[PDB]
Design a protein around this ligand. Structure first.
Ligand SMILES: *CCC(=O)N1CCC[C@@H](n2nc(-c3ccc(Oc4ccccc4)cc3)c3c(N)ncnc32)C1
Length: 263
């Protein structure tokens, strides 16, 4: 049931290449749009990932990119997903032509927060939430992607020269303490990225420097497009004590309240 027959796929366009490799746009059974992520040989702990895919296929939320199945009886293995025509959120935010309104940016945060509240409800950690992981569909809806996938990456630079230092709380950087509250911290950084139109967090600093900054209790500061009420929500994600950070349920309530006040 987790297995797609790759003979049912037609390849139409190259979408680009990440750490597992090439992603293509195509159709399933001649008609339905899909994305096809091809997992480069040596890149993944594939038997672990296949077992996890069974769980991932039962996750279902409107703001979570849907995993349709996998193709594992050849290599490279394929992950078949919902097609997100507007591509990765980070590049979408950096296109200045969009001329976003702040109501649109707030909606992007709300989309992600809904997805994360749903993952929170299923005790499923993202583990690498960031704008580079989120996707945007043809209607401008942002959805969370690549959820949990970092667990199966075999390149140790990621697991590190390529680790997501700029999206990690103090306890992760100091002790490798992952939790729901590390996803919360990352979500605040993602809200910062959205309101900053895709600026790299701590843009003047190296990763090493960033980790020192955070150790000394310093923080990102208010994007020009964020109101004080929006800044309060993102900043709440960065409490030094993990247990004092909000849940995604609380964050969602905070976001809806601001939407209502900023209407
Ligand atoms: C930033 C440029 C860009 O738009 N990118 C990066 C290059 C590929 C492109 N893209 N990737 C996917 C996609 C992501 C993740 C999965 O698999 C997955 C695994 C675990 C959990 C959820 C999903 C498959 C495909 C794209 C999709 N779906 N649509 C369009 N472009 C996609 C994004």
């Amino acid at each position: 049931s987790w297995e797609i027959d790759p003979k049912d796929l037609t390849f139409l366009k190259e979408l680009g290449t990440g750490q597992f490799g090439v992603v293509k746009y195509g159709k399933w059974r001649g008609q339905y749009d899909v994305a096809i992520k091809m997992i480069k040989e040596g890149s993944m702990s594939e038997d672990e990932f296949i077992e996890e895919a069974k769980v991932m296929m039962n996750l279902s939320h409107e703001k979570l990119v849907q995993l349709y199945g996998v193709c594992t009886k050849q290599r490279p293995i394929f992950i078949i997903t919902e097609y997100m025509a507007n591509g990765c959120l980070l590049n979408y935010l950096r296109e200045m032509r969009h001329r976003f309104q702040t109501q649109q940016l707030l909606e992007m945060c709300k989309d992600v927060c809904e997805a994360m509240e749903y993952l929170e409800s299923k005790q499923f950690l993202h583990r690498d939430l960031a704008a580079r992981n989120c996707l945007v569909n043809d209607q401008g809806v942002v959805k969370v992607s690549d959820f949990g996938l970092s667990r199966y990456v075999l390149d140790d630079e990621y697991t590190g020269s390529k680790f997501p230092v700029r999206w990690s709380p103090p306890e992760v950087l100091m002790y490798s303490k992952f939790s729901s509250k590390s996803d919360i911290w990352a979500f605040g950084v993602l809200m910062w990225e959205i309101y900053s139109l895709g600026k790299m967090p701590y843009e003047r600093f190296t990763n090493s420097e960033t980790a020192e900054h955070i150790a000394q209790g310093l923080r990102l500061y208010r994007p020009h497009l964020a109101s004080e009420k929006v800044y309060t929500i993102m900043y709440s994600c960065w409490h030094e004590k993990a247990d004092e950070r909000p849940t995604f349920k609380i964050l969602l309530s905070n976001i809806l309240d601001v939407m209502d006040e900023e209407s």
